Amino acid sequence: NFQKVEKIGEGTYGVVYKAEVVALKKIRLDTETEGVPSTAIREISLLKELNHPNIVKLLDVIHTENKLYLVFEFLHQDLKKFMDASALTGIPLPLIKSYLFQLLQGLAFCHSHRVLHRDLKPQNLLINTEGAIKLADFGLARAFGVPVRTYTHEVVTLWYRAPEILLGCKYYSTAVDIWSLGCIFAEMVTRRALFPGDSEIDQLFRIFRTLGTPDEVVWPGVTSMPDYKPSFPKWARQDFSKVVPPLDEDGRSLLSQMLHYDPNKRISAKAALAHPFFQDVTKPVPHL
């Protein structure tokens, strides 16, 4: 082993310390059982088969009888503490475009390897000092290759939760991940969260207010969804001058396809890389 330098954070997942510099993650065992959480198992089992420059690298796994440490590569800070620090100065478009580009590459790698992330929040995206952004925290992630599996609707903080899950429909994949980045895409430009709801019904209403209340010409099977009710107030759609002003019209275009109501006509990851929004894409270094 080596020596811990500082405690970065502490949540339900466990405790991450900063300890060559590595991120030392201790996993919190179950109360009744003294056993490894299902989430911890998925995260490690997945990260043991995912090797990509835009995905956090699992370096080692220390298993003992009462402890379990996960050694990751160290990245200096997450995206949200970065967005907060740029909240006034702004985030330069070349860096935004660079970040979104990298995020889509890591995501396309996952979806082509049949893996859902199911937690694409700003706080789960780590950045370093050389212009790179990587996906992390695969605790709610899973593979979707095997047919007829049971899925859940506890997946991601409401703010980045796709409407298909909020309306309680079963059988969802990859589309929901793209929705989350769509939200992060907007949150990088305007510097503030796009759909900040306090409940599931509220989250839907914030989405409806911004993107218009869904039709069956926009979303073919929207009215036969388990948690749809005709009571839903019908709002007109605002468009992305009034919603996300600093975006050009190739920018608004990609964003509109990322926030498409119909999951089946929602834009994919590999495809999003080939959008005309990435010709001038470079790799600028950020200010930390």
Binding site: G35, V36, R42, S45, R114, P147, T150
Partner: protein
Amino acid sequence: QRQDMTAFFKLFDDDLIQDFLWMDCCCKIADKYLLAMTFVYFKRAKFTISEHTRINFFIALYLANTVEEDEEETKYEIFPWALGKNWRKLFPNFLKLRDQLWDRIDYRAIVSRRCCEEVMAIAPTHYIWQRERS
């Protein structure tokens, strides 16, 4: 590939195992694919002919459900069959056995669909492979 695949199937000649499948009508914990994954786990864990005990079968099946099934409660019904009717205080030990099997396979618990099909192709007309889910 292997020829000696029944290293796995003589588990399905056992009395309580055959009843365990009978309990699971619609294959919510012992799906045809989950039964394929448990074999994958067996050879990844490099199990000898000695180690094909039913307790090892159950910790392997529980692991498969842990990885591939989001509904966490359903897989709990393995505890009685694997521990007895004092399972309510024995299952922490069961779960700990799972953690070493997961350790033994070097944490490689993810099994692709195509890899399941491969083990289902050696003897595809066995009755455990007609445990489809609808």
